[PDB]
Amino acid sequence: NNPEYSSFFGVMGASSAMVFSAMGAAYGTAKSGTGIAAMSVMRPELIMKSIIPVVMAGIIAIYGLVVAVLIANSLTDGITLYRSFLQLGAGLSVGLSGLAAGFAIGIVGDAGVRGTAQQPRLFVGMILILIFAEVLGLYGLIVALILSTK
Amino acid sequence: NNPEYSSFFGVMGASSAMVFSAMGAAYGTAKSGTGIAAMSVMRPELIMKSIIPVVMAGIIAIYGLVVAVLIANSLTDGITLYRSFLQLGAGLSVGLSGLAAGFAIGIVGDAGVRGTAQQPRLFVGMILILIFAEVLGLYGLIVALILSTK
Amino acid sequence: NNPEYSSFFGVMGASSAMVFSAMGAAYGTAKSGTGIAAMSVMRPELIMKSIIPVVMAGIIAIYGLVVAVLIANSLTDGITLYRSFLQLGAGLSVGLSGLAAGFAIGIVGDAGVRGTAQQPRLFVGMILILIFAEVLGLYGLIVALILSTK
Amino acid sequence: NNPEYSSFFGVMGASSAMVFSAMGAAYGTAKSGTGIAAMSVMRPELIMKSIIPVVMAGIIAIYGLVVAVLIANSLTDGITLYRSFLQLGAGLSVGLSGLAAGFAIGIVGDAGVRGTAQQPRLFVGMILILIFAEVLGLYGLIVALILSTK
Amino acid sequence: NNPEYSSFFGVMGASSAMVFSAMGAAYGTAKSGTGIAAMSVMRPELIMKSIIPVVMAGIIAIYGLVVAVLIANSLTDGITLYRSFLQLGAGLSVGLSGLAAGFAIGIVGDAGVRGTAQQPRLFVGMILILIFAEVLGLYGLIVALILSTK
Amino acid sequence: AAGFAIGIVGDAGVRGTAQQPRLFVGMILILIFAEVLGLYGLIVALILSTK
Amino acid sequence: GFFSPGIWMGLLTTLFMLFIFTYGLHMILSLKTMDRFDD
Amino acid sequence: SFFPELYFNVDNGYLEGLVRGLKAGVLSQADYLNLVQCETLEDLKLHLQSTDYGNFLANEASPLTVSVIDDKLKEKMVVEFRHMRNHAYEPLASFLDFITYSYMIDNVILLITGTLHQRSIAELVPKCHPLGSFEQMEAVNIAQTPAELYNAILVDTPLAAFFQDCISEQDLDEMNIEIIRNTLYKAYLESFYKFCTLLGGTTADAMCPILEFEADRRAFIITINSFGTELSKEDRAKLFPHCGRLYPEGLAQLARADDYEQVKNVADYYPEYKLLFEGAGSNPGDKTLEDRFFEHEVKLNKLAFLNQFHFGVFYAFVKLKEQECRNIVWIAECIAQRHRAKIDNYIPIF
Amino acid sequence: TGLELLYLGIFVAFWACMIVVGICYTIFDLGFRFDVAWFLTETSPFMWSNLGIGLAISLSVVGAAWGIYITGSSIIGGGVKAPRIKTKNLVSIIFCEAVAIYGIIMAIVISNMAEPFSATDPKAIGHRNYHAGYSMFGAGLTVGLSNLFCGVCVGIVGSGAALADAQNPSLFVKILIVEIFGSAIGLFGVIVAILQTSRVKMG
Ligand SMILES: CCCCCCCCCCCCCCCCCC(=O)OC[C@H](COP(=O)([O-])OCC[N+](C)(C)C)OC(=O)CCCCCCCCCCCCCCCCC
Ligand SMILES: CCCCCCCCCCCCCCCCCC(=O)OC[C@H](COP(=O)([O-])OCC[N+](C)(C)C)OC(=O)CCCCCCCCCCCCCCCCC
Ligand SMILES: CCCCCCCCCCCCCCCCCC(=O)OC[C@H](COP(=O)([O-])OCC[N+](C)(C)C)OC(=O)CCCCCCCCCCCCCCCCC
Ligand SMILES: CCCCCCCCCCCCCCCCCC(=O)OC[C@H](COP(=O)([O-])OCC[N+](C)(C)C)OC(=O)CCCCCCCCCCCCCCCCC
Ligand SMILES: CCCCCCCCCCCCCCCCCCCC(=O)O[C@H](COC(=O)CCCCCCCCCCCCCC)COP(=O)(O)OCCN
Ligand SMILES: CCCCCCCCCCCCCCCCCCCC(=O)O[C@H](COC(=O)CCCCCCCCCCCCCC)COP(=O)(O)OCCN
Ligand SMILES: CCCCCCCCCCCCCCCCCCCC(=O)O[C@H](COC(=O)CCCCCCCCCCCCCC)COP(=O)(O)OCCN
Ligand SMILES: CC(C)CCC[C@@H](C)[C@H]1CC[C@H]2[C@@H]3CC=C4C[C@@H](O)CC[C@]4(C)[C@H]3CC[C@]12C
Ligand SMILES: CC(C)CCC[C@@H](C)[C@H]1CC[C@H]2[C@@H]3CC=C4C[C@@H](O)CC[C@]4(C)[C@H]3CC[C@]12C
Ligand SMILES: CC(C)CCC[C@@H](C)[C@H]1CC[C@H]2[C@@H]3CC=C4C[C@@H](O)CC[C@]4(C)[C@H]3CC[C@]12C
Ligand SMILES: CC(C)CCC[C@@H](C)[C@H]1CC[C@H]2[C@@H]3CC=C4C[C@@H](O)CC[C@]4(C)[C@H]3CC[C@]12C
Ligand SMILES: CC(C)CCC[C@@H](C)[C@H]1CC[C@H]2[C@@H]3CC=C4C[C@@H](O)CC[C@]4(C)[C@H]3CC[C@]12C
Ligand SMILES: CC(C)CCC[C@@H](C)[C@H]1CC[C@H]2[C@@H]3CC=C4C[C@@H](O)CC[C@]4(C)[C@H]3CC[C@]12C
Ligand SMILES: CC(C)CCC[C@@H](C)[C@H]1CC[C@H]2[C@@H]3CC=C4C[C@@H](O)CC[C@]4(C)[C@H]3CC[C@]12C
Ligand SMILES: CC(C)CCC[C@@H](C)[C@H]1CC[C@H]2[C@@H]3CC=C4C[C@@H](O)CC[C@]4(C)[C@H]3CC[C@]12C
Ligand SMILES: CC(C)CCC[C@@H](C)[C@H]1CC[C@H]2[C@@H]3CC=C4C[C@@H](O)CC[C@]4(C)[C@H]3CC[C@]12C
């Protein structure tokens, strides 16, 4: 009855939600780790306090995993092509929004840890900027849920 | 009656609305965070007063989220090809308008915060220029809402 | 009653699962090896302690191999297009998530070993960041298993 | 009977195995050799020890050759589309995994040889990292054999 | 009987055998002339001896011309696809082989003209390398003569 | 291709002949070798077109 | 159709030749002339 | 990776081989010992004739002098470098020009110093370093006008880019020549590091360490020498190149530094420099900080020869031959002054 | 980076076009038009076979020339101060040219398997001829690309060996082992091409 190519777009949604979120979280983690290593030479005591960027980057991958698992569970043999489009759109939204959020978190956290190596008062501002760069992935997750659950 | 692929462009509209808006907001947040990290070393007491560009980028992302959720709530299985194209156009409009607005916000916020670290009077000018960049995403949202509700 | 090109997507899933995971593991191992070599001239005693990033990249490659063999054993002559697409999605998910995790592990391991030559305390922070980077690939593996064992 | 074009994909599988594993082995040998030759003017007695990464790259070439021979012996003008796809996937897996392992072995071996010129203790660490990079090509061979024999 | 387009591949093979050989010989002539001009300002007596690489580039061009003339004299109205593609293969062989041989001759001659300017003994070594570089294009011509007369 | 060769060779030769007057004949010979490439192109073009 | 068998064969042949010509043109455009001459 | 292996030798392979051959002619430890064992400058020349140097000093007058030997070594290196530059292409040409900017900086400093003191620029020319010769005629026959000279530098000199650090030509008479020189050198080193990074590949990998160490040593020595002077900390911090590994808070701690103990504490955070500062006893009879930094610089320039497909070989060779010429001049000085006790202070190479 | 910008733009545009074209064909139910069977089948086996022979020879020669210039530049540069390089390190050039010799040998072996059909209908052309064209193309790709990579690798290693010999005579004898290992790859490619075209028969 339904087209046989709908499961392809469904799995594309799942794999995108996972892959792009993983790429964003990986970029965030890599940039934040580079910054942490650079800053810890002179200010070792802040090595742990300067790990918030990495946790906030992993939260993006957790968003992507949530959407990917939702899509993978919703997958079945006879999903209408419209449902497959819904799942693909949810996956793309979560994945690419998380990728952008990972870019922002990586840059913000790198700059913030480097600055906090010199100015302790910048930590709260860095945390707020990281929250503002994380709500982007949160919005992507919200849209992905709204599309998938429909 | 309606083609079975009509909802593809609607889901793409929702996904674009969220993704490109998130990309613009993420670029704005990253640039503004780099500027704040650079300035805070010499002028730390201006971090809270300087967080504004990140808030503007967040507002752009909120525009994108509004349009994406509207499209995802107006997306139905029997979606006419005309309405699917309307929703795709609304999504692209808001997404790319927010992307441009986020680029403007990032550049202007970085430059303005760096300058305000040296010239206090530049703060009000920075706010004016940021509002002028924000109204671009506002216009994108206007057009996207018009197209979606049409 | 199924296309004879159906197995193409599943075979590409297995091939991608191995290939992209291997590319990410190769990037991680190569970058971490360059870092270890650079830092070993001055601080030889830290080579074995600092070989951790290579181990983590190898674990990423093992994730890829696990999913690849799972797909290869799930393959069949009359594999429905649905199962073939599921295996393609799982393969892309694991391969590219492992690729992102391998990039993150490469950058973080390079920076971590180079810094730990200078800052001994940074070792544990580097281990935490590497754990997050590995967790990205673990998420990819989880999604790939969910997709490939439906 | 089977399609007239079925053997195309098995042919390309054997070719891809050989070509990409050859690319990886060639890069590994070239990088390691340009490292060894440059180093040996400084530490002439390390040439025979440092030849090892070249041998690992040759082993990558060997894996590619093995899988290519398997495919080229199991490939007939009337092989099912399924078997042709399996051989294409096995070829891609072995070839690209060997490519990644060859790149990793070249980078790691060159860096480690240069460091060993400066730090004799690093030889064992270099061998460990080279084994870890070689195990990637070994994984690729395992998956390729599973696919080609299946 | 035969397709009206069958002669296209043979015509293009002749055109390629001419054009790519001409490009390779032009590169050889240009690089060798650059080397000779750089050298001559100090050693005017070596211009005639050092004009050899230009002559070998001309020989590459001559091989290209020979194969192009053969194919162009073999083209006929009823040229079958078999002959047409044989001539296409011969043209590709000659053209690309002459291209690469001309590149090698140009580079080696530009190096060796300057080298012989400094060290007179290097002239014979430069000639020895150049003859190999030229017989590469000769091998191309040999394969072309095999093919276009298969 | 012959134009590329003639440009490179002639520019280098005319700039180096200001230094060494004896490079004029070498430049002329190299330019002849570059021009015969265009002449070979012309020969093949004639053989084809007037076929 | 958008393509026919003859168009496909011609396009692939012209694509290989375009790759070869692009490689050659790249290596030619990479040619550089000396900016100085020995005293 | 950039894969320079594929295309480096297309343009720069012959020069790579040539410069490596030239480097193979730098005196080894055995040759340095042989030269050290001499008794007179004539015997120094005699022993040196067996090395790659050959008969570079046979023509000159029998009563050899340290000045004559030094000028001949300088002339030989200038000739070799000029030959390489003349045979180099665009990217390597720019690399070698960047190498020469270092001496062009000192030459322009000499020109402005003489002009502000109303001395003929043509008469200042002979004292300039050959590798930084101002062949341009816009900066000649200036009529002893600093404004005209500044315009000439801006219009017809590669230092126009670095002279935008200043604000006007009045800066020439306002700021001290040492501050002008070091600001110019900071700008030049930053631009050189940027160019090497843009080149990327093995060039960046093998060259950025050398420029980074240059920046760090410049920071350390400027701090250690500006302690007793009127050079304020704010104006001193402007002279630290930002290429070094001290850029985050390291240069800041140095700027706040007010004593050699504080400079050493700053250097402690970086082990590579920690060892140099620990070995720099600085008391009579043992290696000084400058000597330790010379040893490290020579080590880095030697490690630059373990990479293959990179331009850093040429900078390393130029610096190593500069060090070798300095070593030979020092040995000649020890021979002439009969101070054989310190004759081992030369930094060996290879 | 103008030319690389042009190549990157062409690549990105082509693959974006391919992505959207595939999405369109799948979604609009026009997949039956994307007849890869018809492509591979109507496309004449002669095209594949002769492209394969041409690649086998041309790419082998390309790698041989690449390596020869890579190593000859270094040989001649080093020999300005130590001319013994020219006499000793010609072995690297010899290997780089043995690559092209393998190329021509495999071109001959592949070309020996060609033969006309006298048919145009795919059912008449048959599995034997279609697979013959495909396998000759694949063998040409294998030999040509393996030879290209082996020649480039041997050239890089030989430039390194020549530079190292310019400074110490007793190093080339030990560094030639890397050249031998790099050479083995061309032999592997030749063996695989021969295996591929072992049971190949056009006619
Ligand atoms: C910029 C660099 C220079 C260019 C280099 C790259 C060139 C790429 C080569 C392009 C040729 C692609 C094949 C064309 C045929 C397939 C078309 C297709 O699928 O549609 C017809 C197919 C099949 O059509 P059909 O079979 O129903 O039509 C009847 C059959 N004919 C026409 C032959 C009689 O599907 C459709 O009908 C879709 C209709 C809409 C068209 C959608 C085309 C996709 C591309 C549109 C957007 C452009 C993408 C680029 C974005 C911007 C740049 C990044
Ligand atoms: C030395 C190499 C130089 C570099 C490479 C450049 C070579 C360019 C050669 C010309 C293009 C050929 C393309 C493939 C078609 C070959 C012909 C063929 O087999 O067709 C027979 C076919 C036979 O038809 P058929 O039987 O296959 O079709 C089926 C039946 N019908 C047609 C009824 C449906 O007919 C044609 O002529 C096909 C049309 C092909 C048109 C291709 C467009 C080419 C555009 C030229 C490039 C752009 C020019 C402008 C440049 C601007 C300035 C830079
Ligand atoms: C950000 C980029 C901007 C977005 C647009 C990108 C350019 C795409 C437009 C290319 C020009 C083609 C216009 C239509 C031409 C007429 C085709 C035709 O006759 O259609 C018949 C085709 C095929 O025939 P059919 O399906 O109508 O007929 C029925 C066929 N059966 C029975 C088999 C089912 O279908 C249509 O009617 C298509 C109508 C809409 C086509 C619009 C273009 C498709 C591509 C849109 C973009 C895809 C990406 C979206 C997400 C992007 C987010 C960044
Ligand atoms: C950039 C790197 C490369 C990857 C992207 C591009 C890959 C493909 C490029 C080549 C050209 C397009 C190929 C497909 C052509 C259409 C084939 C066709 O219609 O048959 C389909 C076939 C058959 O279609 P059918 O209509 O016969 O359906 C079967 C019906 N029965 C069983 C009754 C016969 O089935 C599929 O749907 C196969 C899936 C592949 C087609 C879709 C291509 C996807 C292109 C990439 C976009 C992915 C979407 C998600 C984006 C995010 C990704 C992470
Ligand atoms: C100006 C310069 C000179 C001119 C330019 C020459 C060089 C450029 C040409 C290169 C090719 C570019 C275009 C590629 C198109 C890809 C496929 C398009 C999809 C499509 O609609 O094709 C269908 C057929 O394709 C199929 O059956 C699918 C076959 C796809 C094979 C693609 C292989 C080559 C390109 C990609 C790989 C490149 C690497 C080299 C191999 C059409 O169907 P229809 O309606 O016509 O069908 C009729 C009977 N069903
Ligand atoms: C990025 C935005 C989106 C773009 C999408 C559109 C598609 C891409 C088109 C290019 C878009 C960017 C603009 C680039 C312009 C061309 C490249 C730079 C200029 C140029 O070509 O000139 C020089 C080469 O000479 C020449 O002019 C020779 C070029 C002509 C050769 C034509 C043969 C190639 C045919 C294509 C098929 C081959 C495919 C291969 C994959 C290169 O200058 P430089 O870099 O040395 O100096 C630095 C500055 N130019
Ligand atoms: C996330 C990224 C995207 C990943 C998804 C994969 C994308 C792959 C791109 C290729 C296109 C998608 C593959 C599926 C579509 C295949 C074409 C189906 C259309 C169709 O009905 O064609 C049949 C023939 O196809 C056939 O029998 C063809 C079988 C082979 C199809 C696969 C070949 C793709 C090219 C692989 C090249 C690999 C190169 C490796 C170096 C009909 O034929 P019929 O027998 O019913 O005829 C009846 C005539 N009366
Ligand atoms: C460390 C932090 C990020 C962990 C928090 C993860 C949160 C955001 C995740 C974990 C599990 C998720 C839930 C899992 C399943 C569903 C059911 C679905 O129909 C609506 C969304 C909903 C209710 C998800 C909302 C988001 C969720 C609660
Ligand atoms: C790292 C941790 C703390 C973050 C949260 C991850 C876990 C708890 C998330 C990721 C995927 C999620 C699942 C996604 C989809 C479904 C199907 C739905 O019908 C019920 C909830 C359920 C089963 C979710 C439960 C929570 C879940 C398992
Ligand atoms: C409260 C803020 C911080 C948002 C965090 C929670 C977000 C990510 C999630 C958690 C549970 C989600 C809701 C769960 C179920 C549904 C029903 C569905 O038919 C439409 C979407 C809707 C209404 C979801 C919207 C998004 C949602 C509210
Ligand atoms: C801080 C951020 C999350 C703000 C998000 C924007 C809010 C205000 C927007 C986004 C989507 C919007 C909803 C979209 C659709 C509907 C359904 C309609 O029948 C009543 C209003 C309601 C329920 C809207 C209320 C406002 C809304 C929730
Ligand atoms: C933040 C604000 C200023 C931006 C959005 C502008 C407001 C005023 C615009 C955007 C889209 C508009 C809607 C678009 C379409 C329709 C349908 C029409 O039959 C009645 C008016 C109505 C419902 C419009 C009301 C005004 C509207 C909501
Ligand atoms: C140390 C060696 C074994 C390699 C390391 C990876 C090993 C542990 C991996 C590679 C492939 C994996 C197997 C792949 C497929 C299956 C089928 C599944 O239904 C049960 C698990 C099982 C049997 C896996 C067990 C773990 C496994 C054997
Ligand atoms: C922290 C630990 C548990 C994570 C590492 C182990 C992961 C990879 C394992 C542990 C339990 C596993 C799940 C257990 C059972 C199933 C049911 C099956 O139908 C789909 C896969 C799924 C849903 C598995 C996915 C992978 C999984 C989550
Ligand atoms: C390890 C590499 C270098 C190869 C050297 C060992 C060779 C002889 C071994 C290793 C793996 C082996 C293959 C592993 C799997 C199978 C499937 C089995 O049902 C038949 C034999 C076959 C096809 C084996 C053939 C021989 C083989 C290729
Ligand atoms: C031999 C050395 C290199 C150790 C590495 C193991 C590799 C080369 C080989 C040796 C034995 C092989 C296995 C032997 C038997 C089979 C069964 C067959 O149905 C699928 C392949 C499979 C599962 C092989 C996979 C690859 C394998 C594990």
For residue C85, give both structure tokens. 């697409």
The one-letter amino acid code at B43 reads R
Classify burial at A6, counting beta carbons within 10 Å of its beta carbon; exposed 0-12, middle 13-18, buried 19 or more.
Answer: buried
Contact of C2 with C80, CB cutoff 8 Å: yes
Q: How far is E119 from chain G, CA to nearest CA, in Å? A: 17
Nearest residue on chain H to I63, alpha-carbon basis:
H6
G2 touches chain E (CB under 8 A): no
Q: Computed over its alpha carbons, how large is the radius of gyration of chain G?
A: 19
Q: List all residues 6 or more positions away from B97 whose beta carbon is below 8 Å from its beta carbon.
A: B136, B137, B139, B140, B141, B143, B144
Q: Whose C-alpha lies nearest to ligand 8, atom 13?
A: A66
Q: Which residues of B touch A93 (CB under 8 A)?
A: 14-15, 18-19, 68
Q: Inform me whether the C-beta atom of residue A22 falls under 8 Å from chain C C-beta atoms.
A: yes
Are C143 and C90 in contact, with CB atoms under 8 Å apart?
A: yes
| Ligand 2 pocket, Cβ-based, cut-off 6 angstroms | E 5, 8, 15-16, 19; G 4-7, 10-11, 14, 17-18, 21
Structure tokens at B29: 């947040």
Longest pairwise C-alpha distance within chain G: 67
Distances D102 to C27, D70, D87, I92 between C-alpha atoms, Å: 11, 21, 22, 22
Tell me H280's DSSP state: -
What is the Å distance from ligand 8's center to A66 Cα?
A: 6
Does an H or E element contain C3, and which? none
Q: Which of A59, A132, A145, A148 to mutate to test the pocket of ligand 10 (most atoms within 8 A of CB)?
A: A145
Nearest CA to ligand 6 atom 40: I7
- Which H/E stretch holds residue C115? helix C81-118
Give the C-alpha separation, D57 to H272, whole Å.
34
The atom of ligand 1 lying closest to the CA of I33 is 26
Looking only at Cα atoms, what is the longest distance across chain D?
65
The closest of D19, E113, D144, D44 to I170, measured between CA atoms, is D44
The full DSSP string for B79-93 is --HHHHHHHHHHHHH
- Ligand 7 centre from B6 Cα, in Å? 25
Q: What six digits make up the tokens of E46?
A: 């070596």
DSSP sequence for H81-95: HHHHHHT--HHHHHH
D115 closest CB neighbour out of C32, C37, C61: C37
Distance B7 CA to ligand 3 centre (A): 12
Residues in contact with C127: Cβ distance below 8 Å, sequence separation at least 6, in sequence order:
C52, C112
Residues sharing a CB contact under 8 Å with residue I23, sequence separation 6 or more, in sequence order: B8
Give, in order, the Cα–Cα distances in Å from D19 to each of D56, D99, E50, H293, I188: 17, 9, 39, 49, 10
In H, which residues are within 8 Å of C117 by CB distance? 271
Yes or no, beta carbons of A38 and H250 under 8 Å apart: no
Instruction: Return all residues near E128 (Cβ < 8 A) that are at least 6 apart.
Output: I86, I90, I93
* Chain H interface mutation, best of E118, E119, E122, highest count of H Cβ atoms under 10 Å: E118
| Method for this entry | cryo-EM
Encoded amino acid at A56, one letter: M
Give CA I51 to chain center in angstroms: 12
Q: How many CB atoms lie within 10 A of CB H141?
A: 12
CA–CA dist B50, B38 (Å, integer)? 12
Contact predicate C87/C148, CB 8 Å: yes
Task: Return the residue whose CA atom lies nearest to atom 45 of ligand 7.
Answer: I37
> Nearest C-alpha of chain A: how many angstroms from C100?
5
I28 lies within 8 A of chain B by CB: yes
Let me know if B80 is exposed, middle or buried by CB neighbors in 10 A (0-12, 13-18, 19+): middle
Q: Which atom of ligand 16 is nearest to the CA of C72?
A: 20
Residues H205, D107: Cα–Cα separation, whole Å = 13
E86: which 2 tokens? 């044989």
Mutate: best of B2, B5, B11, partner I, most I CBs <10 A: B5
User: Ligand 15 pocket, D62 CB below 6 A?
Assistant: yes
Q: What residue owns the CA closest to ligand 15's atom 1?
A: D63
CB B28 within 8 A of CB B56: yes
B60 and B86 in contact (C-beta within 8 Å)?
no
Chain G CB contacts of I3 under 8 Å are 26, 29
CA nearest to H192, candidates H100, H302, H88: H100
Q: Which tokens is A23 given?
A: 């790429």
Nearest by Cα to H42 from H60, H62, H56: H62
Residue whose CA lies nearest to ligand 16 atom number 17: D146
Nearest CA to ligand 15 atom 23: D149
CB nearest G33 (choices: F1, F8, F19): F8
Q: Please give the structure tokens belonging to residue B7.
A: 């909802």
How far is ligand 3, taken at its centre, from the CA of residue I26, in Å? 11
E107–H13: do the CB atoms touch at under 8 Å?
Answer: yes
Residue among I177, I120, I102 nearest E80 (CA): I120
Count of Cβ atoms closer than 10 Å to residue I124 Cβ = 10
CA gap C61, D136 in Å, rounded: 7
- Closest-CA distance of chain G to residue H295, Å: 35
Pocket flag, ligand 7, residue D12 (CB < 6 Å): yes
Pairwise CB contact (< 8 Å): A81 & I26: no
Q: In C4-28, which positions are buried (b, 16+ CB within 10 angstroms) versus exposed (e)?
A: bbbbbbbbbbbbbbbbbbbbbbbbb
Please indicate whether, in this complex, the C-beta atoms of A136 and B38 are within 8 angstroms of each other: no
Residues of I in contact with G8 (CB under 8 A): 39, 42-43
Tokens at I73, concatenated? 């530049």
Could H93 and G37 be called an inter-chain contact, meaning their C-beta atoms sit closer than 8 Å?
no
Residue D142 CA: nearest ligand 16 atom is 26
Gap between the Cα atoms of D134 and C61, Å rounded: 11
State the best of I59, I143, I146, I175 to mutate against chain D, taking most chain D CBs within 10 Å. I146
* Structure tokens belonging to residue C50: 């600092």
Distance D149 CA to ligand 15 centre (A): 9
Task: Check I77 against H16: CB less than 8 A apart.
Answer: yes
Mutation target to probe the D interface, by most D beta carbons within 10 A, among H8, H23, H306 is H306
Segments in chain H forming alpha helices (H): 8-11, 13-23, 29-36, 41-48, 66-86, 90-116, 121-124, 146-155, 170-174, 177-199, 201-225, 233-237, 250-256, 260-268, 271-279, 289-303, 312-337
Distance I37 CA to ligand 7 centre (A): 7
CA distance A38 to H245: 10
H-contacting residues in I 58-87 (Cβ below 8 Å): 66, 69-70, 73-82
H282: left (phi over 0), alpha (psi -120 to 50) or beta: left
Instruction: Report the C-alpha gap between A109 and A115 in whole angstroms.
Output: 10
Q: What is the DSSP string of B6-60?
A: HHHHHHHHHHHHHHHHHHHHHHHHHHHHHHHHHHHTT-GGGHHHH-HHHHHHHHH
Ligand 2 pocket, mutate which of G4, G7, G21 (most atoms under 8 A from CB) = G7
Can you tell me the distance from the alpha carbon of B95 to that of B114, in angstroms, rounded to the nearest whole number?
Answer: 28
Phi-psi region of H201 (alpha: psi -120 to 50; beta: other; left: phi over 0): left
Chain C residues near any Cβ of chain H (below 8 Å):
42-43, 117-118
CB of I20 closer than 6 angstroms to any ligand 4 atom: no
Which of chain D's residues have a Cβ under 8 Å away from the Cβ of C32? 129
Please give the structure tokens belonging to residue I31. 């997949």
**Distance in Å, alpha carbon of D108 to nearest chain I alpha carbon:** 16
The answer to whether F49 and F32 are in contact (CB under 8 A) is no
Q: How many angstroms separate the alpha carbon of residue C66 from the centre of ligand 13?
A: 5
| Separation in Å, CA I198 to CA C76, D21, D78, I136 | 29, 21, 15, 10
Tokens representing residue B81 in the block: 């090809």
Residue of E nearest to I93 (CA): E129
Q: Which ligand is nearest to the CA of I17?
A: 1
